[PDB]
C-alpha cells in the first residue's frame, strides 16, 4: 500500500502547552496545480539579489501612478526608483499617498508633500489674514489620497481632514474636518476603497463617500453606516488592500486579534487557529509595530505580515482546502525575513531590507538572499499507523538549475515534538533533470510518526508529492 502524504500543512504539538499547532512551511509556497499524482506542488520563495544601494533601512513604498514610477523612502532619504528626489526625517515607517500635483509622505506627525517641480510643502492651517476656517490639525498619523484631496487622520482622535482642491498644502477652506463618531474609537489608520474614504478605527471601520454638495460650509463627506464593519485594525500599518478589499489584523478591543478580510460590511477571518495563537503570542505594542502588505507574482496572491519576530504569508490562490499560511525567514536560525516593502516595478519585484541599507529585486532563478544560503522546511501531518513499517519515502523534485549539488535532510518524529536523526540526501544536482529523491528503509512506526524535510541551498526547491509505502 502506497499512501500519499500532504506537505501543505504539518500537524504537531506545542511543547509549551501540549496544544496541537499547525506546522507551517518555511520559505515555501503551495501551488494548486495538478502534476503527476499530486494535485499541487511546493516551490521555494523567490530569492533576493541586490539591485542598488540606499542610505538607511526601508521605511515605505508605493507605486506613484501619476509619475509611473516606484517611490520608496529608505532611511533619511526619499527615492524615485534609482534616483534621489527628496529628504525625509524620522526613523520609523511612514505612510505615503500620491497625487497629480505632488507626492506626499506622512512623517513625524506632518503630511509632507514632495512636489514634482522640486519644492517641498508641509500641510498647515490657512493664514489668518486669508479669512478661511482655522482647524486644530494636531499630529498626522496616516494619509491617503482621493479625488485630488489628501485625507489624513489626527493622531489620538477620531477626526480627519481633507486638503483643498486649489491649494493642497492647506486643508479645505470651509469643510475640512470630519469625524468617525459612530463609536468612541480613535482613527488608527485611514485608507481608500473604491470612492470611499475608509477610516479604520480602534473598534469600528467606517466608510465615507462624497456628498457633492456645492454650498460653502456643507459637509463633503457623510458616513455610510451600511458598510460599517464592527472589527478594527490593531496597528497603524496593520492594513493593506487585498482581493478588491482590505485585509487587517483585529484590534484587541474586539477580542483576541486575528486576520480578517473586509467583505460587504462584514469581516471574515482567514487566520488558522495556529496563526491566531502566533499573533496572540506578541504583546499589544509589538503587534502595533507590525506592518502588512500584499504581493502578487505568477498565480499567487500573497498577504505578507511583518510581525516583529515572524513573517506570515497567506496565499489566497492555494487556499481551497483551507487558509494556507507560510512563514518566511532569513538565515539558518529563526531570524526575521529581511525582505520588506515589496512592489512590482517594470518586469522586476523590488523589495527593501529591514536590516541593511540596500534594496533588492526578487529573482526567480535562485532562492538565495543577497548570495546567502537559506533554509526551506516542509512538515507532514502526524498520522497514526500502529505496528506499520514504512520503506519507500519518495518526493519528486525538479532539478538541473542549481549551481551546486543540494542536500536534503530527512528526519522523522515520533512524539510530534522531538525529531530523530537526520539523513543526508542529494536532492538536486547541476545539469541533471532525471534525479530521483528517494529514501528506503525509513523504519517502523510504533504509534504515530511525522516527517520534516530540511533543505539548505542557494537554488530553488520544488517538491511536489510525498508518497510512502506502508507495509
Amino acid at each position: 500500500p502506497i499512501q500519499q502524504l500532504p506537505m501543505m500543512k504539518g500537524m504537531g504539538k506545542d511543547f509549551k502547552n501540549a496544544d496541537y499547532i499547525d506546522y507551517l512551511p518555511v520559505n515555501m509556497l503551495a501551488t494548486p496545480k495538478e502534476i503527476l499524482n499530486s494535485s499541487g506542488y511546493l516551490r521555494s520563495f523567490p530569492g533576493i539579489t541586490k539591485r542598488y544601494d540606499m542610505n538607511g533601512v526601508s521605511r515605505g513604498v508605493e507605486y506613484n501612478t501619476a509619475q509611473n514610477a516606484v517611490y520608496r523612502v529608505c532611511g533619511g532619504k526619499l527615492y524615485k526608483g534609482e534616483s534621489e528626489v527628496g529628504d525625509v526625517a524620522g526613523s520609523g515607517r511612514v505612510s505615503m499617498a500620491h497625487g497629480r500635483t505632488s507626492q506626499a509622505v506622512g512623517v513625524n506627525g506632518q503630511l509632507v508633500e514632495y512636489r514634482y517641480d522640486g519644492t517641498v510643502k508641509t500641510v498647515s492651517n490657512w493664514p489668518a489674514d486669508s479669512g478661511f476656517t482655522q482647524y486644530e490639525l494636531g499630529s498626522v498619523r496616516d494619509i491617503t489620497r482621493l479625488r485630488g484631496r489628501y485625507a489624513w487622520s489626527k493622531d489620538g482622535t477620531d477626526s480627519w481632514f481633507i486638503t483643498d482642491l486649489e491649494d493642497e498644502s492647506h486643508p479645505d477652506r470651509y469643510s475640512a474636518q470630519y469625524r468617525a463618531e459612530s463609536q468612541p474609537d480613535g482613527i488608527i489608520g485611514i485608507g481608500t476603497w473604491r470612492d470611499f474614504i475608509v477610516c479604520f478605527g480602534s473598534s469600528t471601520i467606517e466608510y465615507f463617500s462624497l456628498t457633492g454638495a456645492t454650498t460653502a460650509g456643507a459637509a463633503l463627506y457623510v458616513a455610510q453606516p451600511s458598510l460599517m464593519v464592527q472589527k478594527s485594525i490593531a496597528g497603524t500599518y496593520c492594513k493593506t488592500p487585498f482581493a478588491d478589499s482590505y485585509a487587517f489584523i483585529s484590534h484587541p478591543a474586539t477580542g483576541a486579534p486575528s486576520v480578517y478580510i473586509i467583505g460587504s460590511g462584514q469581516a471574515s477571518p482567514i487566520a488558522t487557529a495556529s496563526i491566531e495563537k502566533i499573533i496572540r503570542s506578541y504583546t499589544a505594542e509589538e503587534m502595533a509595530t507590525g506592518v502588512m502588505e500584499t504581493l502578487r507574482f505568477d498565480s499567487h496572491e500573497l498577504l505578507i505580515i511583518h510581525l516583529p519576530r515572524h513573517v506570515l504569508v497567506y496565499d489566497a490562490s492555494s487556499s481551497q482546502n483551507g487558509p494556507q499560511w507560510c512563514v518566511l525567514k532569513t538565515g539558518l536560525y529563526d531570524d526575521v525575513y529581511r525582505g520588506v516593502d515589496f512592489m512590482y516595478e517594470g518586469n522586476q519585484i523590488t523589495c527593501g531590507d529591514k536590516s541593511e541599507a540596500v534594496v533588492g529585486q526578487l529573482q526567480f532563478d535562485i532562492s538565495s538572499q543577497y548570495d546567502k544560503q537559506q533554509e526551506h522546511l516542509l512538515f507532514t501531518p502526524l498520522f497514526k499507523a500502529d505496528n506499520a513499517r514504512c520503506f519507500d519515502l519518495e518526493v519528486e523534485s525538479s532539478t538541473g538549475v542549481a549551481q551546486y549539488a543540494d542536500r536534503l535532510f530527512l528526519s522523522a518524529t515520533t512524539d510530534g515534538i522531538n525529531y530523530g536523526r537526520e539523513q543526508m540526501i542529494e536532492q538536486n544536482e547541476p545539469f541533471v533533470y532525471d534525479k530521483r529523491v528517494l529514501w528506503k528503509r525509513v523504519g517502523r512506526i510504533r504509534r504515530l510518526i511525522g516527517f520534516k524535510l530540511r533543505v539548505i541551498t542557494k537554488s530553488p526547491v520544488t517538491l511536489s508529492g510525498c508518497q510512502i509505502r506502508l507495509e
Binding site: R194, Q224, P225, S226, L227, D244, G263, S264, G265, Q266
Partner: protein, 61 residues
C-alpha cells in the same frame, strides 16, 4: 395649499448590509442597493423641503 404642509412618511432609513443576500448580488449591485436607499432618503428630504418652500411662497402670496 394645506396638503403641502404635512411631510410624507418614509420607510426604513437604509439597507444595512445584513438583510441583503450578500452571497447572491454582485459587487456593483450590492453597492447599488445602499446607494438607492441613501438616494431615496435624499430625494425625500429634497421633496419635503420643496413642499415647505412652496407652501411658504403660497401663503405669503
Amino acid at each position: 395649499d394645506p396638503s403641502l404642509n404635512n411631510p410624507v412618511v418614509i420607510q426604513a432609513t437604509r439597507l444595512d448590509a445584513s438583510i441583503l443576500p450578500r452571497n447572491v448580488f454582485s459587487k456593483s449591485y450590492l453597492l447599488y442597493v445602499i446607494a438607492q436607499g441613501t438616494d431615496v432618503g435624499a430625494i425625500a428630504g429634497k421633496a419635503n423641503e420643496a413642499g415647505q418652500g412652496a407652501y411658504d411662497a403660497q401663503v405669503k402670496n
